[PDB]
Amino acid sequence: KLSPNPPNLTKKMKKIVDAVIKYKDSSSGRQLSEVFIQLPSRKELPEYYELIRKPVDFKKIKERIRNHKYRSLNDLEKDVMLLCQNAQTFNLEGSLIYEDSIVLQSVFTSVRQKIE
Ligand SMILES: Nc1nnc2c([nH]c3ccccc32)c1-c1ccccc1
Numbered sequence: 001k002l003s004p005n006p007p008n009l010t011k012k013m014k015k016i017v018d019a020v021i022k023y024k025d026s027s028s029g030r031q032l033s034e035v036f037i038q039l040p041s042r043k044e045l046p047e048y049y050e051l052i053r054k055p056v057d058f059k060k061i062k063e064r065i066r067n068h069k070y071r072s073l074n075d076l077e078k079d080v081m082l083l084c085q086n087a088q089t090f091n092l093e094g095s096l097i098y099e100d101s102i103v104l105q106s107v108f109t110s111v112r113q114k115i116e
């Protein structure tokens with residue numbers, strides 16, 4: 001049970017993550033975040049957990065905002081960048097999931113800059 005963040009910070013983290021999650025592909029209209037909202041279980045995808053040291057998904061990113069685990073936008077950014085790097089490790093270059101993760105990193109940076 002961590003000490004609560006200032007409300008403005010919690011509110012800002014949620015605003016940024018909400019915008020990344022809602023973002024739609026600029027050609028197909030697909031919500032890029034969809035595959036990354038909730039990890040498959042270990043039973044469903046054991047190869048993922050065999051490879052990736054610290055699985056994260058947008059559900060966990062929201063939990064870490066909620067529980068005040070992130071103490072700044074930099075802590076939040078580190079986990080969103082980890083989510084995308086994990087995608088780049090488990091999926092091939094030139095796969096849609098890989099290339100979607102590169103786009104989502106750019107969306108996070110852009111939205112954070114705007115909300116700041
Ligand atoms: N190749 C993937 N690669 N990365 C992830 C993922 N699901 C996630 C759910 C949450 C976080 C990362 C991932 C998948 C996947 C996509 C379709 C079906 C099963 C898993």
